């Protein structure tokens, strides 16, 4: 029973960062070689575990979190980072044990007129707790006057779309990111290496 890593990594359509997708890998055999023997990843950073030892370890569960962000924001997907993506879209714990993998997606997620289906949360009062998912579309209140569900001055929609055009710079270009988190609990171990 091979673990379905390709379902996350080789998927046609990815998710927005404000609605990052999570898949639970359980009860399967995982070969991480396919991940650490590939040359298609711009970013491959594993915190708290080396990739080489990953095939020799057993875990209770694995979590694959996939989303699409900008290149300049890929640095925010790391322990102890600050920024719009880290604070309001996707927060990694300071004591994070897992692998962040990221590749360029200008060929698939950048369109000549601009791809406006990818969105990020722009306005939020408080920073996001680790592994939190805010999907609220409530109008943000920037002042004393209530919004009453109507956009206006000091009353803004919380989500803004990336302008993903193929002529953009690498920093403004889209990047697909998968975060692997390995969990071990006082429960039977279901994810094991070869």
């Amino acid at each position: 029973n091979l673990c379905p890593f390709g379902e996350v990594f080789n998927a046609t359509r990815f998710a927005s960062v404000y609605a990052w997708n999570r898949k639970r890998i359980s009860n399967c055999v995982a070969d991480y070689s396919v991940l650490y023997n590939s040359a298609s990843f711009s970013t491959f950073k594993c915190y708290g575990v080396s990739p080489t030892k990953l095939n020799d370890l057993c875990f209770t569960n694995v979590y694959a979190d996939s989303f699409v962000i900008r290149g300049d924001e890929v640095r925010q997907i790391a322990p102890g980072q600050t920024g719009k993506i880290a604070d309001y879209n996707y927060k990694l714990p300071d004591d994070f044990t897992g692998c962040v993998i990221a590749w360029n997606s200008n060929n698939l997620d950048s369109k000549v007129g601009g791809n406006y289906n990818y969105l990020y949360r722009l306005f939020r009062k408080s920073n996001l707790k680790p592994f939190e998912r805010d999907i609220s579309t409530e109008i943000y209140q920037a002042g004393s006057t209530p919004c009453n569900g109507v956009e206006g001055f000091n009353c803004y929609f919380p989500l803004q779309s990336y302008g993903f055009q193929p002529t953009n710079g690498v920093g403004y270009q889209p990047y697909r990111v998968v975060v692997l988190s390995f969990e071990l609990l006082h429960a039977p171990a279901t994810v094991c290496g070869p």
Partner: antibody, heavy 117, light 110 residues
Framework: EVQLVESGGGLIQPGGSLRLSCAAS????????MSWVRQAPGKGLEWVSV???????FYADSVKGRFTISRDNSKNTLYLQMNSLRAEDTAVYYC???????????WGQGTTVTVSS | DIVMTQSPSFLSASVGDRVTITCRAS??????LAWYQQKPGKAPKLLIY???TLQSGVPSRFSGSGSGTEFTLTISSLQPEDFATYYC???????????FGPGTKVEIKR
């Protein structure tokens, strides 16, 4: 209604400290990105620092480790503490509210800070 | 870093003329561009955001266009109060939060 009123500029010897303040009306400083932008005499505008709603603070490389951005919410006031001034910080500083891709809509009158021995 | 340039540095025009000023970027920034106007001794005033959308309370003669590396600001009919300096600003940049352009000054032709 909407107004950002600044204060705290003046003359300072190099290596001195000055605190700039920006009282807000019509907007809540907590619930907004608040930025400081300076214009040197006869030059353009340069970003200094930004404070987020969640508390994240970011500073420009020219003023990293010397400038601190802060806010008081009882007074709805933005503060910029400038230490170890080096005479290239001599400029007119403005406090503005940042709306990201919507731009900086609300600006203040600006306060003049002159660093000279 | 992405460098913002603005041309022309100085432009002379008369009341009623159509004025076009260009702002260029070293690398494509999509529509992350803003246009501001500043008069001497006063704070900058936001005119256009997203390089095409007018800010509320700004006259309709101001219009913005462009995507990627080239952007343009056009005043259909230059009015006497429109003589000022105009700046273009990049949005959502790294490392700086935003970078302003050199600036273009519109002056009275004679």
């Amino acid at each position: 209604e909407v107004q950002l009123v600044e204060s705290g500029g003046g003359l300072i010897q190099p290596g001195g400290s000055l605190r700039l303040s920006c009282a807000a009306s019509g907007l809540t400083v907590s619930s907004n990105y608040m930025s400081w932008v300076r214009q040197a005499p006869g030059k353009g505008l340069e970003w200094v620092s930004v404070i987020y709603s969640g508390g994240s603070t970011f500073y420009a490389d020219s003023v990293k480790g010397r400038f601190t951005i802060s806010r008081d919410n009882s007074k709805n006031t933005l503060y910029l503490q400038m230490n170890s001034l080096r005479a290239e910080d001599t400029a007119v500083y403005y406090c503005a509210r940042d709306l990201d891709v919507y731009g900086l809509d609300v600006w203040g009158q600006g306060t003049t800070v002159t660093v000279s021995s | 870093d992405i460098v913002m340039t603005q041309s022309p540095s100085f432009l002379s025009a008369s009341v009623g003329d159509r004025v076009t000023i260009t702002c260029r970027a070293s690398q494509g920034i999509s529509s992350y561009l803003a246009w501001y106007q500043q008069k001497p001794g006063k704070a900058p005033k936001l005119l256009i955001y997203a390089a095409s959308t007018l800010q509320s309370g700004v006259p309709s003669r101001f219009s913005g266009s462009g995507s990627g590396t080239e952007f343009t600001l056009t005043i259909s009919s230059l009015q006497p109060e429109d003589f000022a300096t105009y700046y273009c600003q990049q949005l959502n940049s790294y490392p700086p939060k935003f970078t302003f352009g050199p600036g273009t000054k519109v002056e009275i032709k004679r």
